[PDB]
């Protein structure tokens, strides 16, 4: 479990995301797609995008980044008590979208990448460690739900 102090490090940094969810979302999805291009193929609406410029200009990709970070932010704000939030997310991502845990690791890495990039003076090792622990917990719990749902992930 994360300590309360660890959750406060997580939520202090997420409050930065909350100032500009859309812009953080764009950065995160673009980082994901550039670092792991196979992930882009999972998105039927977005897999035609050829360049970062096209990704930045996509209003629908911007909207999707808001969708993703809105969901993740609610999960983080539960401070581990996220069972209800993970049910629909796990079901769609296991059954419909077919997103392996390794791809959830990739987007976690992108989130951390972007936080470190955007917030160079207020995202140190301890804050990054706490964010990592929160994302690890999310993935652990999603993986358990994937198994319950019948997906190997």
Those residues whose C-beta lies under 8 Å from the C-beta of residue 40, and which sit 6 or more positions away, are: 32, 33, 46, 47, 49
- 137 in contact with ligand 6HE (CB under 6 A): no
Size of the site for ligand 6HE (CB under 6 A): 15
Q: Which of 137, 131, 114 is nearest to 25 (CA)?
A: 114
Residue 130 interacting with ligand 6HE (CB under 6 A): no
Segment contacting ligand 6HE by CB under 6 A, of 12-20, 52-60, 63-71, 112-120: 63-71
Q: Are 116 and 128 in contact (CB under 8 A)?
A: yes
Q: Considering only residues 48, 63, 97, 140, which one is a binding residue for ligand 6HE as defined by CB under 6 A? A: 97
| Closest residue by Cα to residue 28 from 130, 153, 131, 112 | 112
User: Nearest to residue 118, comparing CAs of 34, 33, 14?
Assistant: 14
Shortest separation between residue 10's beta carbon and ligand 6HE, angstroms: 14
Q: Is 55 in the site for ligand 6HE (CB under 6 A)?
A: no
Contact present, 149 and 91 (Cβ < 8 Å):
yes
Under rule CB under 6 A, residue 134 binds ligand 6HE: no
Q: Among residues 18, 23, 43, 118, which is the contact residue for ligand 6HE, using CB under 6 A?
A: 43
Cβ closer to ligand 6HE: 99 or 115? 99
Q: Which of 131, 96, 152 is nearest to 14 (CA)?
A: 131
Binding residues for heme b: 93
- Which one of the spans 3-11, 19-27, 68-76, 114-122 is the region binding ligand 6HE (CB under 6 A)? 68-76
Of residues 43 and 113, the one with the C-beta less far from ligand 6HE: 43
Helices 21-35 and 59-77, interaxial angle, to 10°?
100
Q: Please report whether residue 48 would count as binding ligand 6HE according to CB under 6 A.
A: no
């Amino acid at each position: 479990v994360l300590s309360e102090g660890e959750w406060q490090l997580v939520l202090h940094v997420w409050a930065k995301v909350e100032a500009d969810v859309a812009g953080h979302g764009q950065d995160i999805l673009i980082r994901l797609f550039k670092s792991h291009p196979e992930t882009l193929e999972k998105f039927d609406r977005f897999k035609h995008l050829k360049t970062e410029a096209e990704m930045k200009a996509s209003e629908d990709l911007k909207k999707h980044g808001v969708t993703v970070l809105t969901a993740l932010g609610a999960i983080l704000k539960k401070k581990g008590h996220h069972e209800a939030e993970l049910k629909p997310l796990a079901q769609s991502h296991a059954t419909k979208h077919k997103i392996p845990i390794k791809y959830l690791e990739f987007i976690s890495e992108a989130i951390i990448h972007v936080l470190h990039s955007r917030h160079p003076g207020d995202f140190g090792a301890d804050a990054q460690g706490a964010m990592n622990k929160a994302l690890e917990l999310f993935r652990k719990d999603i993986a358990a739900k994937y198994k319950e749902l019948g997906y190997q992930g």
